[PDB]
Amino acid sequence: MSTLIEAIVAREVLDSRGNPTIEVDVRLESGDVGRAIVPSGASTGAHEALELRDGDKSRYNGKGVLKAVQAVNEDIAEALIGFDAADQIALDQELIALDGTPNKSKLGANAILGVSLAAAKAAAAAFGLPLYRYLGGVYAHVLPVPMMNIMNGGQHNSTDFQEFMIMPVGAESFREGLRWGAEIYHMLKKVIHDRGFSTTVGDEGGFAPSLPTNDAPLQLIMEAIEKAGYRPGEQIVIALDPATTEIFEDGKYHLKREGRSLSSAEMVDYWVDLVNRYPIISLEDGLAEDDWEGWALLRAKLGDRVQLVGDDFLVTNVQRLQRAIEAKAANSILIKLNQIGSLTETLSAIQLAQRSGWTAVVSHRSGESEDVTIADLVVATNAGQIKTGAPARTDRIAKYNQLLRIEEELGSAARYAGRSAFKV
Amino acid sequence: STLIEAIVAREVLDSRGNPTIEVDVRLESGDVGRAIVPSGASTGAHEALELRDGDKSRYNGKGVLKAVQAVNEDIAEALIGFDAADQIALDQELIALDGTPNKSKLGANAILGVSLAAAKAAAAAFGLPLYRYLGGVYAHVLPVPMMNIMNGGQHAFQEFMIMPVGAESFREGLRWGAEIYHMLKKVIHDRGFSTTVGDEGGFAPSLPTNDAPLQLIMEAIEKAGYRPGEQIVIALDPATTEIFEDGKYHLKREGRSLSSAEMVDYWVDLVNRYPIISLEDGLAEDDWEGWALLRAKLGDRVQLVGDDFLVTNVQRLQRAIEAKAANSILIKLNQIGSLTETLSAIQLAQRSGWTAVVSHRSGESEDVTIADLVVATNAGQIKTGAPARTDRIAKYNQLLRIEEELGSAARYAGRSAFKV
Ligand SMILES: [Mg+2]
Ligand SMILES: [Mg+2]
Ligand SMILES: [Mg+2]
Ligand SMILES: [Mg+2]
């Protein structure tokens, strides 16, 4: 096939926020070239892969990526020219070995992921296989139900909770499900203005108004689902990302707009009440980063009927995930490629969660790009769920278009996750 | 080998979440060209009309299934076995097949998609980058971007943009503009609030005066470490949409109002105080007497761009050239409908001493053809929005790639972009 690496070149490009990022090109003996743009975004922690920014305040306010570009054009290229790109595992374990650090701090998670991803793409093109087939094999065919970000809050009048998303569970295909969501998001754009507010997008595309209650965004969403012609529960469900680790502050959980506080036990009580009122199927970071005792209590009270997704709580970390699997601290994990740093390690987290009865929710980043790897990765692993944001900005829309293509390409083999995406 | 083997169209979404057509052209060589043809919509009748279904049960009538059927059936049957390397011939076949002068039978969106995808497929077959296949050996000029950093009006003076003329490369001009866009997003927060962004990246804040957005921009330029006039210059698209005529020049809120002659005198005031190199749609769509007066007054110092005034139409471009109504035209691929017709309009303006400003549409895509088209024609200028959304960043990223690929051959337009 001639899958041996000939060239590894990197350049500094811009992300969806206009911040510098790394784009890597892996050229094979065959002549095939794989290209990858690496994302970023938000304040995350608790043992994660570190990306390499320049720190040169005279270029992009210190956010430059040239040091990472160097690591690829020199260090990585020297080590991998002549390596077989068709050996993803061996390559990723060569990239990890070359770095030497456990958090990919010497070369950068961004340089390692760039090469990790471009290598796979280069190889897929060499075999003449679509990326989802190359990655997941002959049984890669499940189109995910998207968690579409139609409404925003948290911190940039606010709002205590951050993300309010809709899920087209009842649709027959990804194509129809994307239409439903698009239609509802546009109905919410009509409803918002027709209630006395403004309508411009965010970083994903969600509308961020100034509301009086925490139940108001759920009430508005319910109206937009109905006035669009869709049945709540049966056709459309709600997925929330309150990102409570933001309002934690030395124990208690501070609800400024509701003038309340309490402990994890009463924070759990709040979710149980809200879940009984709205068709909420998923809740991500309902409790804080390290409130491990709280998480298990939320699992016991809602885990039988609500998908509880570890985001900042699990940070796509295989050691944290193994603890949360054992502890019974959640039933779902949000997957971010650049939080772990390699394609092999990502697939390992996805498989560890999936084989433990958990669901893996492949997520995008705040600063995305024209790169649509997560669309082929979500199908390759038959994840059944994707978090890519509003059907608005091309950062988000590009992934939706790739899922439209993957579905078309699969033909009769294509199968939409539907209610099967969930463990409920 | 470069003969067309298959033409496949699908319905995808644009940057606004509205259906758009994507066209794939597959050659006997095995090469596939793919083009996303989205839509903007400024003013009627555009002289090239796209095909939207009108079925309100799907995407509130904004669906493009009819255009997909025109491509998969009408256009596919007619072009299979056609040499895709023959751009002009293929484009005159698409024009023939439609038969209407506005491309209303098949849809402008169906024709442009096949038109661009056929080029991409051929460029890949010869193994040449798109700008080289399009423009030949002398395609090497990197454009000075028109970076939108402020808005106002509808589709949430209208557009306020910066132009990094002083830079030594596109790469440094891109940084300059991005740093100033980030510096201004701090001056809006420190001298007010409201910050959001969308659809057009340059956030629109509720301001007290009409000369004030220029004062905010001019501060942010100096606050970022950049020299106005020298390094950074201002380009304005006031628009004249809501500023309707008869009664002439409705200026609100300032209560100045009338007329077309007084309107020209306002632009001479801002230009003599602030560094404004370019003015687009400074007067109305069909105020031909006004444009001609506007050209005689400051056409020798300022670039006057005919956007809604010309609507990328050749017949009225010829008129405005003779009438000396402007010295620049804004080119929109979707507005004319084919590649051959775009290049034709670009060359006509360029060769009669005008400049060609290659522009994006309001609902864009991941499609990045305008970056290869702007270098292929050595146009010297691009208007592709703010350094924010991926619909806009994809284009800037492509220009970075084009520059790098050119190596020592690359030349940034700079001050030479303008005829002043
Ligand atoms: Mg987060
Ligand atoms: Mg979160
Ligand atoms: Mg317009
Ligand atoms: Mg305009």
Author numbering:
A (entry chain A): 1 to 156, 159 to 426
B (entry chain B): 2 to 157, 163 to 426
Question: What did the authors write?
Answer:
Enolase (2-phospho-d-glycerate hydrolyase, EC 4.2.1.11) catalyzes the conversion of 2-phosphoglycerate (2-PGA) to phosphoenolpyruvate (PEP) during both glycolysis and gluconeogenesis in all three domains of life. Enolase is a metalloenzyme activated by cations of bivalent metals, such as magnesium (Mg2+). In the present study, we purified enolase-1 from Chloroflexus aurantiacus (EnoCa), a thermophilic green non-sulfur bacterium that grows photosynthetically under anaerobic conditions. Each monomer of EnoCa contains an amino terminal domain that consists of a three-stranded β-sheet packed against three α-helices and a carboxy terminal domain that consists of an eightfold α/β-barrel; both domain features are typical of the enolase superfamily.
High-resolution crystal structures were obtained for the apo protein as well as proteins with 2-PGA and PEP bound in the active site. The EnoCa structure containing PEP (PEP EnoCa structure) exhibits the so-called “closed” conformation, where the L1 loop is located closer to the active site. Like the apo EnoCa structure, a metal ion was mapped to the active site in the 2-PGA and PEP structures. The presence of 2-PGA and PEP in the active site of EnoCa was confirmed by calculation of a simulated-annealing OMIT map. In contrast to the 2-PGA EnoCa structure, PEP was coordinated with the second catalytic metal atom in the active site. The second atom was identified as Mg2+. Mg2+(II) was coordinated with Ser43, water molecules, and phosphate atoms from PEP supporting the octahedral coordination sphere. PEP itself is bound by Glu165, Glu206, Lys338, Arg367, and Ser368. It should be noted that the electron density was absent for the Ser43 in subunit A of the PEP EnoCa structure due to instability of the L1 region. Nevertheless, the Ser43 was modeled in subunit A with reduced occupancy (0.5).
